[model samples]
Target: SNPNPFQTTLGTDAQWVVFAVMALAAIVFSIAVQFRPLPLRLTYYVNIAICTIAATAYYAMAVNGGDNKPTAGTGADERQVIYARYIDWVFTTPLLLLDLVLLTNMPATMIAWIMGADIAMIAFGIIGAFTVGSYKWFYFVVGCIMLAVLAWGMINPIFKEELQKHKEYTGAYTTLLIYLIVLWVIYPIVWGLGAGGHIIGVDVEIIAMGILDLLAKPLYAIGVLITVEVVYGKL
Candidate 1:
């Protein structure tokens, strides 16, 4: 009878928790941004897209038996199925950059270039996650370097200009970027250990990445909304 996929499984309960809660969180915050300005509206929409992808991916993992594909490595043959996440990143990561671009007065072309790098970073991450054996780290290393470039862009020129222009709103925006930088720094570690390397089992991998998404996407959206509305006053 269809091999009874759930029989040897271990992480189903965890996936349910991650998907169920994140799905609702997306719509809840997305509704709050109606009638706002372009930056805020677009920010919330980005949140929606990220959460939607996360929820869908987690739900699939919860029921679709895991997404582990075979690898050529000796002991690490079945790496975690990571295509869903990379697919999510393809759409969401650039939008995440757009949020930063909008908040600051960064030039449209500058935003374009930075976002292009961001997309490359995520794509490299995805490629590494799916890559098997000793070759995967090459993609991972490249992704990490691209991430450093983007982080440098944010912290160096753009962040300085943003703080100077919005003196009255310094704390709100600074906190958001700092928080984002920190979260992003952790993603590579998770990728190296779990999804990218398949060192850990699926259950732990799902929980690790899922928690990061909840914080980065949904909770981060709430922070953005509040910062705009409160600091700008009645926006």
Candidate 2:
């Protein structure tokens, strides 16, 4: 629910047009992920599915229009909840976690735990976003803490060992990891300023989040597809 201090309608006016463009872009890239050939890695398929989800979420967002009502009966205004926005995260976030899980060959148990942390992160974020007035920060801090733990798990020793095992593809894996980390680190900052703080306007927040998702999903997915040729070769 990264909205604004001033009231704004989400799926109305020119903004919806912009969202259409984003949808098409995601769709093209998602399909392109499968362009090479058959026998692609599991990560590739997962990437496609997430891109599709992102694209559909855009459509849902575009159609919904001027969403949310944070103040409820008090007086509806800018702080309203954007249902499509959170819906997007609910589906995509877990899949995003699974992408890394598959790429690194993480154990099923660890995958569950890490995904658990992701759920907590987003859940807390939702709580923070909808909470009225000044108290939002409490949930924000807790959610951010979970986000940090998620980051550490992705970059932790277990993955380091996985990378070491795939020594031949270290450069590729490292590149993907670095890119993911660099882009991912910005998410918390954006959340703090937008949803958590409600400082930036709704348009700015949505556009910023949109760009990041494109970069992290389709762009990052493409990178992984290219980088995992070594794995492809092995396959």
Candidate 3:
């Protein structure tokens, strides 16, 4: 018998593969938050918030969406989809807030560059949503809102001085280098355990996708501890 009957079908398997890749990319990018040498107390908070929202989103999307399978046409299935979609909206709204915070904290040049990239991504996402007939309108809407908030954040007075101060830190570059190496190391481990094989009740193919959902609390705690060490020159 298949260990995961719900996931035994080829379509489900393909969904898991796509989910794994996307989740891995998000994790790698999220980890990059640590390498910003500038003391980003607010940004750190935003990072944690983003991670929290991401974790919640993953759980709702995975468990309620029946691991990417379509609704069963039963009452239970309908309820699950509805609940999952609701949770998806709740969890995703905060990401825009986090994006706003990041944009506010970054330099103007960086903001402009990021916005340009974001516009391209938004356009592609819209096109893809239409072409694939995906129920991802929420995703596109959220993406647009995130970009708008980012733009607004760039001009916010609360982060103006700190953004200027961040430019002076050589630590950011060093941190970036270290983060990239660490990411390279982490991606394979996470993918192998989470995506490559099942462990500790998590499905292997969905391992990478489930990492944030299963490990966010511990990861956040460890990250905070490490940040403290880095700030105090202990690491």
Using Cα atoms with residue i matched to residue i, what is each candidate's TM-score against the true structure? 0.82, 0.80, 0.38
Candidate 2: regions farther than 4 A off: 1-38, 67-78, 157-159, 162-165
1-235 in candidate 2: lDDT tens per residue?
A: 3335433554244346555655665566556656666666466667767777777777766565454443321343345455566677777888876665555666667667777878888888777777767777788878778877777776653446653445555566556666777886787787778665666766676767777877887777767666565577776
CA lDDT, every model vs. true structure: 0.68, 0.66, 0.40
Clashing pairs in 1: none
Residues 65-167 of candidate 3 have per-residue lDDT tens digits of: 4443442223322211112322432343344333333323555576565455445434434332233223444454455555455444434433356654333
Q: Model 1, 53-165: lDDT tens per residue? A: 77887777677644444322334254435456677777777766656555666666766677777899988887776666678888889889888888777665434754344
Best-matching candidate per lDDT: 1
Clashing residue pairs in all predictions, respectively, total 0, 0, 2
On a 0 to 100 scale, what is the lDDT of residue 228 in model 1? 65
Q: Which candidate number would show the highest TM-score if scored against the true structure?
A: 1
- Estimate candidate 2's alpha-carbon lDDT, on a 0 to 1 scale: 0.66
Q: In model 3, which range of ten residues has the least summed lDDT? A: 76-85
Q: Single out the weakest 10-residue window by summed lDDT for candidate 2.
A: 68-77
In candidate 3, clashing pairs total 2
Candidate 2 lands at a TM-score of 0.80
Give the lDDT of residue 192 in candidate 2: 75
